[PDB]
Amino acid sequence: YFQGMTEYKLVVVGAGGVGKSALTIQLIQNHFVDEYDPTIEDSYRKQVVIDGETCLLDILDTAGHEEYSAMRDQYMRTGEGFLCVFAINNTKSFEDIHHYREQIKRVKDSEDVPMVLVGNKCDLPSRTVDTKQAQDLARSYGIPFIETSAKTRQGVDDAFYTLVREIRKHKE
Amino acid sequence: YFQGMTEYKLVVVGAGGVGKSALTIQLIQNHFVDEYDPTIEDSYRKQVVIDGETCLLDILDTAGHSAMRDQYMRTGEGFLCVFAINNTKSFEDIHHYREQIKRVKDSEDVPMVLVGNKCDLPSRTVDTKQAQDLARSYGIPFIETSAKTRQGVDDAFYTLVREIRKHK
Amino acid sequence: FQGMTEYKLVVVGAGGVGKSALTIQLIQNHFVDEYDPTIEDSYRKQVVIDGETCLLDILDTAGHEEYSAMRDQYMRTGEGFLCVFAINNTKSFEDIHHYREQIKRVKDSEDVPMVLVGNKCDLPSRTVDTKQAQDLARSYGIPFIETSAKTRQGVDDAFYTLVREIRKHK
Amino acid sequence: YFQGMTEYKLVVVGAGGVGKSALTIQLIQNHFVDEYDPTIEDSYRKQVVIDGETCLLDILDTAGHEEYSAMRDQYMRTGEGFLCVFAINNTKSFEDIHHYREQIKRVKDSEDVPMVLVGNKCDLPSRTVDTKQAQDLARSYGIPFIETSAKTRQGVDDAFYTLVREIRKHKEK
Amino acid sequence: YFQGMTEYKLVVVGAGGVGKSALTIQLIQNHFVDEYDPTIEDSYRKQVVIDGETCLLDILDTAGHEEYSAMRDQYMRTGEGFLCVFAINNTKSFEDIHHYREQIKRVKDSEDVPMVLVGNKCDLPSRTVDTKQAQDLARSYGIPFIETSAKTRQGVDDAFYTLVREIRKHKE
Amino acid sequence: YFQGMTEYKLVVVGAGGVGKSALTIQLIQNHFVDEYDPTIEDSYRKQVVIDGETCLLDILDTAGHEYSAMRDQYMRTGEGFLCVFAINNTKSFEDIHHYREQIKRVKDSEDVPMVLVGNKCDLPSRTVDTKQAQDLARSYGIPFIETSAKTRQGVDDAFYTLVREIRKHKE
Ligand SMILES: Nc1nc2c(ncn2[C@@H]2O[C@H](COP(=O)(O)OP(=O)(O)NP(=O)(O)O)[C@@H](O)[C@H]2O)c(=O)[nH]1
Ligand SMILES: Nc1nc2c(ncn2[C@@H]2O[C@H](COP(=O)(O)OP(=O)(O)NP(=O)(O)O)[C@@H](O)[C@H]2O)c(=O)[nH]1
Ligand SMILES: Nc1nc2c(ncn2[C@@H]2O[C@H](COP(=O)(O)OP(=O)(O)NP(=O)(O)O)[C@@H](O)[C@H]2O)c(=O)[nH]1
Ligand SMILES: Nc1nc2c(ncn2[C@@H]2O[C@H](COP(=O)(O)OP(=O)(O)NP(=O)(O)O)[C@@H](O)[C@H]2O)c(=O)[nH]1
Ligand SMILES: Nc1nc2c(ncn2[C@@H]2O[C@H](COP(=O)(O)OP(=O)(O)NP(=O)(O)O)[C@@H](O)[C@H]2O)c(=O)[nH]1
Ligand SMILES: Nc1nc2c(ncn2[C@@H]2O[C@H](COP(=O)(O)OP(=O)(O)NP(=O)(O)O)[C@@H](O)[C@H]2O)c(=O)[nH]1
Ligand SMILES: [Mg+2]
Ligand SMILES: [Mg+2]
Ligand SMILES: [Mg+2]
Ligand SMILES: [Mg+2]
Ligand SMILES: [Mg+2]
Ligand SMILES: [Mg+2]
Known part of the structure; x- marks a missing residue:
């Protein structure tokens, strides 16, 4: 019997400063965070309807550079799906x-982990990573690629909802 | 691909005056209709969330008292079979009604809920136990309702949707 | 703001008083006619109470349970308690x-958010008068709500009232 | 040109103790008030959907006996529709x-004021006003009658939604 | 009396590849479809609130080039309002x-058919159709013009909600 | 006792043509108004959820150039203010x-909930640098947000941020 909404555990990973927090806060609060306040670990919750199903999203916002690597392994083990975020003006983040992907696959001992590749800051004019390169990388992994902007909100809902759909597909 | 919410086609059947319309209008408009205006055929719609899934209910409200009857039985996915607990004949x-539905749909396992309506009234002639035994014999849920107090109204419709979902 | 406020509610009371039926009415809008004894079950629902979005985590307990350290442990997670009796069952009252003493013991406090719930008000076999229950609740400084899991009278109100009691305490 | 949801100013009137406040609080908070705390004047707001239209209910909960009569005149002038409440165990309230209806018509200087007759406390056993008598009265005024219980919530939404429907009919005249 | 929400039958028309499907999928799923999968015929539904009224939108997504012309006439007869879509980087589509407009007017035997002119892909830098020219075209038909991006979601809700408002004006 | 949702009285001010109306109509109707129809005074309402609290927003859309007793009246009743300029209009900045001094004078307070809004951020012809606007907002101790009534960038955020500023002030 139904005891309450389905819950999805989402984890946002990627290099320092790519906009992991800004993406999450845009989703949760409809607010763009202009300041750069480095994250240690924050968790957020939101109830949404995706494809007619009520979902509770548990979202873990991670540090770009994780010092305690056992803590990183722990959230990778518990996460059901991953947003792998880079910034389109930051070649190194790409x-x-x-x-990030290898770490996740190693910990989960699986080649088929729900993930979405996210190219963030698509509002900025100084692009150094071509859409084609990111699409090719995503295709090589068999995952969706989405361009986002935490500032304009382009692709933000889509990235999270697409990841929930990948989790759903994986469980079906 | 998701093209929009799941739709369920529900049909409310039973004898004249048992409260088919009153149940439906209570669901749709949160209004109790005190007057008895016999129905020909009316259709209603409502979007609801049941067990975390959004769905569009299409509800066909039928006349108590035959090609038209066969047509709605063919199109219906689930049936509320309504009697009034103060009307032995309706029971x-x-x-x-059950045999008609099974015949038309050429099925033994058609989603249905037995509904004993007007449970607010003191002059009960149909025992709860008798209705429960009948529903058990059919393998379907039984619910007592009152279109007046709204007791069991959402439950009757939601239960039927759950029966359709089990069957699918 | 990292997402909605969560409230941990625990439903306690004697065997058969309708703890599960009340919870399932809240969650599913369904009346359960059958009596399936509970050990421990948990439910969740998002609601709006006084304009605030709340996630309710509801723990549905056993009415017949000897002393358990494991019982004490899950009860200690509760922020507020519905103490349920049936109005036709004097012993449950x-x-x-x-139940009140158990809750005070496990929470190690005299001031625990609680609501007294008199269930099955639809039945003709009332043995506990409204005034007696109201007097008991007044003696504890808590609300009393009469419910019927069958008609759904007072069901939302019992849970929402408990959330309001938790908010007052916080 | 849409500037936000339509607002309806609803006023709840009737004798002391008939359950005006209990009805309103049941609508707004889904809470039954067992205590009898006499009202002076309280206002509540709720957004609802009625017949597929979103609207903002501005509800003025009034005192049974209004001492300052200019205050009474003021809310009757501003109100767009009125719930006239009696208790089914209180013949005098009926x-x-x-x-109450004559007072509203006098203040508004109109014969056609949106109103609903509400027979409250229908959960109680000692009924003194028969349903038929209330229905006959409502029919004589050309208005809906609804039986309610602020305790069980029977008819509560219906009473308020029906009044909004009466206001809409009057406005669409 | 009221038997449930008002239903509006909307039809999306225009040249091949202008983003008819992408607009509809953005509306329904908050998802941007990057791939070009040519449509034959798809129908979608969504419940929305527009100007305080609850509406059930039935949206018919059509093929750019319709071979069976009786089938085209049939959906034009049944449709209550039309989004006429072009892409702002595709002069031919404009x-x-x-x-498309003449086809609709011919089938419905009316000069007053609810319609909105939609200039899609306004996120792209290679604009060939000027906004002023599109506005002038819309003005010549007495209909609204809206610039959209199925990618950024700019104007997407607005195009559909505006069409519902045009239908309501025609019905009253 | 809870009598229904909390209401917030928001007032949108700024020079003629900066997009005060377009911002408000985008919020209320999800519609971009391309035409320039000068405002006298309009009021709008919307119920929203902000940080888990249901809010009724009462929004007063004002004339760029105002009868000054009428101006004083809405400044007295307003709980929070969006102060809007256009990023392609130096004079509006x-x-x-x-506007800020007028509000502080009328409300007889140095601490009035406000948000500085740089609108039309979709346009390429920027004359007001982000740094200058950020410095100004910092000098007032208020948030700065860039908006576009056309693309809807920042629109919800500007209004919701102002409600958060009002809530902070009310504790
Ligand atoms: N223009 C623009 N700036 C963005 C975007 N997303 C984030 N930023 C900016 O980039 C900076 C870093 O954002 P932040 O969310 O803190 O990054 P993070 O990946 O969470 N960093 P960390 O790993 O340290 O926790 C901030 O100044 C933020 O405003 C975006 O989509 N567009
Ligand atoms: N007391 C009480 N009256 C009810 C209830 N349900 C319906 N009624 C009343 O019973 C009468 C008939 O109800 P109605 O909905 O019209 O019945 P129906 O089955 O739709 N009739 P038909 O088959 O002619 O269309 C009305 O007077 C109505 O108010 C109920 O639960 N309790
Ligand atoms: N008439 C009526 N029966 C009720 C009501 N609530 C519960 N019941 C019935 O009482 C029986 C026991 O209810 P249930 O919810 O299982 O009780 P419980 O308190 O959860 N029992 P346990 O402690 O063993 O888990 C069931 O047959 C149920 O239908 C009510 O309000 N009215
Ligand atoms: N059983 C029952 N009691 C009710 C009902 N409605 C109200 N009451 C009770 O009757 C008493 C008076 O209710 P209240 O709402 O204060 O009445 P009022 O009309 O607002 N009074 P006043 O005119 O002084 O403000 C309270 O004790 C309340 O609990 C009802 O439907 N059922
Ligand atoms: N950048 C951008 N690309 C868009 C936009 N809308 C559509 N596209 C792209 O344009 C291509 C065609 O879009 P699609 O929706 O299939 O077009 P259509 O009008 O439905 N095609 P058809 O008539 O064959 O069915 C796809 O690659 C899609 O990603 C938009 O607003 N911006
Ligand atoms: N590109 C663009 N144009 C905008 C934006 N906001 C407003 N405009 C345009 O600017 C013009 C003036 O907008 P309007 O909302 O009337 O300004 P106002 O500040 O309300 N004027 P007034 O003070 O007279 O009432 C209109 O043509 C409108 O379309 C925006 O974000 N981007
Ligand atoms: Mg961060
Ligand atoms: Mg009927
Ligand atoms: Mg149990
Ligand atoms: Mg009162
Ligand atoms: Mg297509
Ligand atoms: Mg203006």
Whole structure:
């Protein structure tokens, strides 16, 4: 019997300063955070309707650089789906993506972990990572790619909702 | 791909005067209709959330008292079979509604809920136990309702949606 | 703001008083006619109470349970308690004292958010008068609400009132 | 041009103790008030959907007996529709209804004022006003009658929603 | 009396590849479809509140080039309002608009059919159709013009809600 | 006791043509108004959820250039103010200090909930630098948000941020 809404555990990962927090806060509060306040670990909750199903999103916002690596392994084990975020004006953040992905696959001992590749800050004019390169990378992993802006809200709901759909597909 | 909410086609049947319209209008408008205006055929819609899933209920309210009857039985996915707990004849009619539905749909396992309406009234002629035994014999849920007090109204419709979902 | 406020509610009272039926009416808008004894079950629902969005975590307990350290442990997680009796069952009403003492013991406090709930008000076999229950609640400084899980009278109100009691305490 | 939801100013009137406040608080908070705390004047707001239209209910809960009569005139002038409440166990409250209706018509200087007759406390066993008598009275005025219980919530939404429907009919005249 | 929400039958028309599907999917799923999968015929539904009225939108997503022309006439007869979509980087799609409009008017035997002119892909830098020219075209038909991006979601709700308002004006 | 949702009286001020109406209509109707129809006075309402609290927003849309007793009246009744300039209109930005001083004078307070709004951020012809606006907002101790009534960038955020500023002030 139904005891309450389905819950999804989402984890947002990626390099320092790519906009992990800004994406999450835009989703939760409809607020753009202009300041750069480095994260240690924050967790958020939101109830949404996706494809006609009520969902409770539990979202873990992670540090760009995680010092205690056992803590990183713990959230990778518990997370059901991952947003892997880079910034489209930060080539290094893009090159870091494969490390996040490998870490997740290693910890979960699986090649098929729900994930979405997110190219954030698409509102900025100084793009250094081409859409084509990101799409090719996502295709090589068999995952969706979405361009986002925490500032304009382009793609924000879509990135989170797409990840829930990937989790749902994986469980079906 | 998701093209919009799930739709459920529900049909409310039973003898004249048992409260089919009053149940439906209570669900849709939160209004109790005190007058008895016999129905020909009316259809209503409401979006609800049941067990975390959004769905569009299409509800067909039928006349108590035949090609038109067959047509709505064919299109219906689930049926509320309503009698009034102060009307023994309406209860005895339930067997006929059930057989008609099974015949038309060519199925033994058609989502249905047995509804004993007007449970607010003191002059009960149909025992709860008798209705429960009948529902058990059909393998369907039984619910007592009052379109006047709203007791069991949402439950009757939501239960029927749950029966459709089980069947699908 | 990291998301809605959560409230941990625990439903206690004697065997058969309608703790599960009240909870399932809240969650599913369904009346359960069958009596399936509970050990421990948990439910969740988001509601709006006094303009504030709340996530309710509801723990539905066993009415017949000997001393358990494990019982004490889950009860200690509760922020507020519905203490339920049935208005046709005098012994369930007399057992309310025991539930109240248990809650005070486990929470190690005299001031625990609670609501007294007199369930099955639809039945003709009332043995506990409204005034007696109101007097008991007044003696504890808590609200009394009469409910019927069958008609749904007072169901939302019992849970929402408990949330208001928790908010007052915080 | 849409500037936000339509607002309806609803006023709840009737004799002392008939359950005006209990009805309103049941609507607003889903809470039954067992205590009898006599009202002076309180205002409540709730957004609801009625017949597919979103609207803001501004509800003025009044005193049974209003001492300052200019204050009474003021809310009757501003009110767009009125719930006239009696209690089904209180014959005097029912006999008062005609006078509340006449007071409203006098203040508004109109014969066609949106109103609903509400017979409250229908959960109680010692009924002194028969349903038929209330229905006959409502029919004589051309208005809806609804039986309510602020305790069980029977008819509560219906009473308020029906009044909004009466206001809409009057406005669409 | 009231038997449940008002239903509006909306039809999305225009040249191949202008973003008819992408607009509809953005509205329904808050998802941007990056791939180009040519449509035959798809129908979608959504309940929304527009100007305080609860509406059930039935949206018919059409093919750019309709081969069976009796099928085209049938959906034009049943549709209550039309989004006529072009892409602001595709001059040909803009020059085609008058053909779609004439088809609709011919089938409905009316000069007063609820319609909105939609200039889609306004996120792209390679604009070939000037806003002023589109506004002038809309003005010549007596209909609203809205610039949209199925990608950023700019104007998407507005285009559909504006069409519902046009239908309501025609019904009253 | 709870009598229904909390109401917030918001007032939108700023020079003629900066997009006060367009911002408000975007919020209320999800509609971008392309035409320039000068405002006299309009009031709008919307119920929203902000940080888990249901709020009724009462929004007063004002004339760029005002009868000054009428101006004083809405400034007295307003609980919070969006002070709007257009990022392509230097003069509208220079006017901001006058609106702020008027509000502080009328409300006889140095601590009035306000948000500085740089509107039309979709346009390419920017004449007011973000740094200058941020410095000005910081000098007043208020939030700064860039908006576009056209793209809807920042629109909800401007109004919701102002409600959060009012809530902070009311404790
Ligand atoms: N223009 C623009 N700036 C953005 C966007 N997302 C984030 N930023 C900015 O980039 C900076 C870093 O954002 P932040 O969310 O803190 O990054 P983070 O990835 O959470 N960092 P950390 O790993 O240290 O926790 C902030 O100044 C923020 O305003 C975006 O989409 N567009
Ligand atoms: N007391 C009470 N009266 C009820 C209840 N349900 C319906 N009624 C009353 O019974 C009468 C008939 O109800 P109605 O809805 O019209 O019945 P129906 O089954 O739709 N009739 P038909 O088959 O002619 O369309 C009315 O006077 C109505 O108010 C109920 O639960 N309790
Ligand atoms: N008439 C009526 N029966 C009720 C009501 N609430 C519960 N019941 C019935 O009482 C029986 C026991 O209810 P239930 O919810 O299982 O009780 P419980 O308090 O959860 N029992 P346990 O402690 O063993 O888990 C069931 O048959 C149920 O239908 C009520 O308000 N009215
Ligand atoms: N049983 C029952 N009691 C009710 C009902 N409505 C109100 N009461 C009770 O009757 C008493 C008076 O109710 P209240 O709402 O204060 O009445 P009022 O009309 O607002 N009084 P006043 O005119 O002084 O403000 C309270 O004790 C209340 O609990 C009802 O439907 N059922
Ligand atoms: N950048 C951008 N691309 C868009 C936009 N809308 C659509 N596209 C892209 O344009 C292509 C065609 O879009 P699609 O929705 O299939 O077009 P259509 O009008 O439905 N095609 P058809 O008539 O064949 O069914 C896809 O690659 C899609 O991603 C938009 O607003 N911006
Ligand atoms: N590109 C763009 N144009 C905008 C934006 N906001 C407003 N405009 C345009 O600017 C013009 C003036 O907008 P309007 O809302 O009337 O300004 P106002 O500040 O309310 N004027 P007034 O003080 O006379 O009432 C209109 O043509 C409108 O479309 C925006 O964010 N971007
Ligand atoms: Mg961070
Ligand atoms: Mg009928
Ligand atoms: Mg139990
Ligand atoms: Mg009162
Ligand atoms: Mg297509
Ligand atoms: Mg203006």
